[PDB]
Amino acid sequence: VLLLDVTPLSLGIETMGGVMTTLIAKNTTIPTKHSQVFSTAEDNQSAVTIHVLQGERKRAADNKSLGQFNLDGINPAPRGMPQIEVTFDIDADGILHVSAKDKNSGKEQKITIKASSGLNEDEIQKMVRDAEANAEADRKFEELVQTRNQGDHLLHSTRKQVEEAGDKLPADDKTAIESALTALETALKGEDKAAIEAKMQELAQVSQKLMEIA
């Protein structure tokens, strides 16, 4: 061959908070195969949407949508139990194969995206310039969304452990933890990274007796 196919933009999926999670880094020569494991956002969630994106922006909306499919039939389970393995496989012909398989159940759904799909050679240059120009705001969006996601994770896991401890949790601890949960829940609604991180830390500080019930 005289030529190799190389990705000019990151490829990946939309994850919680409308952020792009990259499966295939830009400047990758094909063929290539990459996979990452995702999970559900809620207890008893029966489906996940695989929204395939191309671009260098952090907000899913600012990137090029290549397609979407659902993986459904996820049997009821705790948040984080399902193991949704998402595979991006680009063959020699430049066709993107997207697979999502729950490795717990072997249930799988797929799409194929044609080598022609996505941004053109002008739009690629337009996308690279936008990412360059928006680099700082894009980073602050990504760091805020991730900090909220982390607060959300602590909030859910701490609530689970309160539920499990039941009547064994003393009243001083129950009152302090419930009150710390409300405070973090309120912080997540804001745009202040530091405020969410402080409420995470204050919850962690009062929850130590909680984990000592096991």
Binding site: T15, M16, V37, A41, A47, V48, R79
Partner: peptide
């Protein structure tokens, strides 16, 4: 869009 979240890969103590 049924929400899909990151899964925290585990780390060992060496």
């Amino acid at each position: 869009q049924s929400t899909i979240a990151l899964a925290l890969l585990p780390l060992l103590f060496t």
